[PDB]
Amino acid sequence: NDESILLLTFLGFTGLVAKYLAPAYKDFADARMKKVSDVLNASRNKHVEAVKDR
Amino acid sequence: FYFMNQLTYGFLLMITLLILFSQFFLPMILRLYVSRLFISKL
Amino acid sequence: PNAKRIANVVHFYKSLPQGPAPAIKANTRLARYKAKYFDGDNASGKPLWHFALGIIAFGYSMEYYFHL
Amino acid sequence: ESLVSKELKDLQSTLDNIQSARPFDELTVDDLTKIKPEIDAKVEEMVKKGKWDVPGYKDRFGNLNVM
Amino acid sequence: MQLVLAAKYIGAGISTIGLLGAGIGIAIVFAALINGVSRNPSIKDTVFPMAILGFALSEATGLFCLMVSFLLLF
Amino acid sequence: MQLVLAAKYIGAGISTIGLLGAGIGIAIVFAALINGVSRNPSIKDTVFPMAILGFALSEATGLFCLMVSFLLLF
Amino acid sequence: MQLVLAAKYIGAGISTIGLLGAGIGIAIVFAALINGVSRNPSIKDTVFPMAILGFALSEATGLFCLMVSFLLLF
Amino acid sequence: MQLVLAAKYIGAGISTIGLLGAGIGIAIVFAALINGVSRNPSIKDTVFPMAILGFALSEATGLFCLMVSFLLLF
Amino acid sequence: MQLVLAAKYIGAGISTIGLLGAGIGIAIVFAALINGVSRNPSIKDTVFPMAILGFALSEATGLFCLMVSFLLLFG
Amino acid sequence: MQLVLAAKYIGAGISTIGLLGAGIGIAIVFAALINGVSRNPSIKDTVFPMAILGFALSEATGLFCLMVSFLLLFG
Amino acid sequence: MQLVLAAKYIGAGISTIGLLGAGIGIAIVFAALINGVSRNPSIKDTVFPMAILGFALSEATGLFCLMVSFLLLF
Amino acid sequence: MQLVLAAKYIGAGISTIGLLGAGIGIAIVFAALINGVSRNPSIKDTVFPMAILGFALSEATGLFCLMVSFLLLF
Amino acid sequence: MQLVLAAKYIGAGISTIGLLGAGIGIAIVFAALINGVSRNPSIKDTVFPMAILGFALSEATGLFCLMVSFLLLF
Amino acid sequence: MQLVLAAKYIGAGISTIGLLGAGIGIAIVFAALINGVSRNPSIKDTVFPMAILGFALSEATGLFCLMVSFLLLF
Amino acid sequence: LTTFSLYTIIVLLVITSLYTLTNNNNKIIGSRWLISQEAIYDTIMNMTKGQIGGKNWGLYFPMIFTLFMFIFIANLISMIPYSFALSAHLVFIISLSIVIWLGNTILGLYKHGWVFFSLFVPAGTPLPLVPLLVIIETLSYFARAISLGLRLGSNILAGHLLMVILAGLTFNFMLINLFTLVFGFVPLAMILAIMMLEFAIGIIQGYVWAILTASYLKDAVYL
Amino acid sequence: MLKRFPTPILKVYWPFFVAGAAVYYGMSKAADLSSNT
């Protein structure tokens, strides 16, 4: 093919997000889904303290 | 030329995709927000 | 006062107790998209990568059918 | 004098429903609609008015934006 | 036939010099950026979107040039 | 006879050099924005409708070098 | 004969390098407005009419682009 | 007979690039005014005559770039 | 012999094209005056002649080429 | 047809005026670097690489002009 | 002579564009003067003779310029 | 028949205009240095070799615009 | 034999813009002169050894402003 | 072997317009030199060597500019 | 048959089946392949809040969202290489943009009507100011239409036009010799350095369309 | 599957519903016989 370079010009652009930008989003979002999954839980334990007064 | 041919379903694609957002796919996460409110204030 | 202390007494009690019935035993080519790569374990650049590996095949074929 | 005395277990049955009956983060959302239908009722009233900005979200959660 | 085509080439050369302003247009939106970052290092979270839509308006408007010259190349 | 059809677009090809009026015309306004918010942050939402009112009167005023090409191209 | 309108097409298309300063004239007047109101926010009520005053005395002649270009093409 | 007004239509546009100096010369006169009066809003009362005798001589060249461009009218 | 007169037609076009130097130069001196008297009014009658001295001396690139450029009409 | 190969020969030098934006565009971004770090030396590595990302777009305009001349060069 | 020595009139028209840098040097040494006497008024009449040589020295290119414009006239 | 090898001498001498791009360019970085260490003479041992990086990177577009002038030799 | 060698006094008009931005060149050190000495009046006797003697170091370039003009003129 | 003698004359003269970069670049190297010694008089010999580096950086571009006229003139 | 609408039905296929893979059967936790969709959701919630702000605010919010995600996934065709693009087919974009130009003015008809002449100057004016600047600002109104869609259509087709001209250069630089691979590696990742910025342009060209459309229905809706 | 909601579409995008028919018909005066050069 005369245009053989065409699929080749992201040999490393596909590798850029695989090596340099894989934790730049996957290890960005995991703490955020960690953040919601306990600030509901810790406030739920505040319900276990609010039910103890009455 | 043939400017007409893609435009027939060009912006016709818009008025069916808005309704998938404005009625179906956009507000499905707003329930996902307010469920995080009725677990916030309990 | 009493009102927040009684707005919880239904929805804290009447829900599911165990997080049971995992519903991963529902495989009829409707949920079999996500039990392979969309489980919460790996998180690499995989489901985007197999999107492009088909459309470059869908791209190269349509001139192989047209002219080549 | 003992009017609330027969309310001696309705909060105690919840306490046993919290020490080993808390699946708060592996359960879904539409079960809560079967639990509380009013969480969809204010959804309907905040859609027709055009109130997508839910108040009481930013004080507890982030914006999750690129700002 | 090539006496009229001989000016299509000289147009497409002289046309694509109006985007020398596309370089320097995409420059002072960064030279005036880090004067902000040096004078207030806690504003970089919100001043970055003001210039990332800053130059995209600029360097595309300089990119109007080769949209004309490619018509006069092809 | 048709040898002046070349003069139709070489007169149009040089008309893209008038785009630096929008090449720099919206660079420095945004370069006057992104430092002008860093000097005091809480006037972000007052000068930003001032800027779009200054943006569109500058690049669209530098846009109609495109029209003298297109009615010359067609 | 034929060479009349050829001589008009490279003169009318070369008039649109003339609006180049007219584009970046709009830039610097809107530059120092959002740099002038930036430290004094209590001045937009008074000097923003002075900023737009810099068009009706200024671009009333500064935008003679097609007025010199297509004018004798009637 | 094809050189009745042969080189007249071309020169009237290439002469009309002097509106660059008439463009941004019509600009800094107000652009230096506005951040100047943003330093001191009390001096606005005395530059109301200085924008008179600052701008009118600034576009003295503005009449001098079109009367040269009016070689063709009369 | 109207070929050279056609050249003096277009050569009149690049004759007094050089008013950019007297176009932004005639304003940048006033860009310094009006930012000068802004910061202090106690020079209001000192440099106002001296920027007038900047005014006419900036037009030495203005009306210099013009004396044969406006006079190539009759001769 | 040696006029078109003259026409694909005259136009490279008329398409390289547009480089001069990139000749100075990489410097005025560098101009804000050195007086950038002069106000604080503790900013030295949080403004260095982003203005190189601020630099890199300015080169592509100058790398938009060389490909025009080279497509004008090769046939 | 009609094609040989008559050609030199357009060589003069490109000789008289060299004064665009002349008009700035008889402006910006004036422009640093008025701000130079701003923050120090009592340096006035020592700098005012050291700056008028800047009017003479910068315009020396503006006056050596158009000698080649009048080399072909007289 | 002489014309293709005739454009070898107009097609390169017009190509060396943009060598001023490094000319005014490469000194601006030096024009940043000598008033940059005015306000702070201490930190120069690390910020000077980073300016040579700017010296060398804009010198690369100080030889590109003479690269095609030496393509004349082939 | 008459229409070719006549161009040596035609391209000798284009070299009047060689570096004859004295306003961009020669004058801006005299601006920086009376900028600096209006900050320290007691320093002007050490800056003339580096400004006006530095001026010829700038006009070492300006030696050949028009040496290429007259050499192919007479 | 006719008109190629004209193109080595006209194209030689345009090459010196590129010496503007050597002219202006040899100006800001001193126009930023002396405002630096104005604020800090005592600390001088840390930049006077690197200024002639900046001058040699600027004049290398102009000396890689003008000699292409006399590249293959004979 | 239709030989140019081959992948237009893919464009809504990625978002009629976005719920298939993002929403993990309606969990409130919102895992990693979903939390971007709410990350991209609030990035339009913020910007149209800060420059509309009034009471009648979120009513046009779905339209200004569905313009974003429609051209945000224009980047798919700029990286799939063996394809003649749909954003390169600029006749549809510049005619999608003609309806959003006049559609606000016809939204200004029954809402505002006779007061809509107040585009002259939003500040004070004497007599000679207004009647000769009104043509200067409506020059930003009857050319407001073409200025939007062309900007998208001109920046993105160079994603396959400023790059396919290099493919004629580097494939011609390889079929010369085996010892022609000199001067370092220019027919290599230097081209990759060119491509990813236009790839990143494809993100910010969508985001600039959200901002640009947001500013126009601020004054066409509010007084 | 999904939930439907009565979201206000016609009474607020009726200019853009009308304007879709405005440019479509404009091509019936442009792509009838004026496209055969």
Numbering used by the authors:
A (entry chain Z): 53 to 106
B (entry chain 8): 7 to 48
C (entry chain U): 19 to 86
D (entry chain 7): 107 to 173
E (entry chain S), F (entry chain T), G (entry chain K), H (entry chain L), K (entry chain N), L (entry chain Q), ...: 1 to 74
I (entry chain M), J (entry chain R): 1 to 75
O (entry chain X): 26 to 248
P (entry chain J): 1 to 37
Please give the exact wording used by the authors of the publication that reports this structure.
The F1Fo ATP synthase (M.W. ≈ 600 kDa for the monomer) is highly conserved from bacteria to mammals. The c-ring, connected to the central stalk of F1, rotates driven by the movement of protons down the potential gradient from the cytosol of the cell to the mitochondrial matrix, and the proton flow provides the energy for the phosphorylation of ADP in the active site of F1.
We used single-particle cryo-EM to identify the binding site for BDQ on the yeast F1Fo ATP synthase. This analysis was performed essentially using purified enzyme reconstituted into nanodiscs made from palmitoyl-oleoyl-phosphatidylcholine (POPC) and cardiolipin (cardiolipin is 12% by weight). To improve the Fo structure, we reprocessed the cryo-EM data starting from particle picking at the center of Fo, instead of F1Fo. This strategy generated an improved cryo-EM reconstruction of Fo at an overall resolution of 4.2 Å, which is of good quality with side-chain densities visible for many residues. The binding of BDQ disrupted the interface between the a- and c-subunits as compared to the reference structures. The side chain of aMet215 is on the face of the helix closest to the BDQ molecule, and would clash with the EM density of BDQ if it was in the reference conformation. For instance, the phenyl ring of cPhe55 is displaced by as much as 3.1 Å and accompanied by distortion of the α-helix. The cation-π interaction between the t-amine of BDQ and cPhe64 is likely to be a critical interaction that stabilizes BDQ binding.
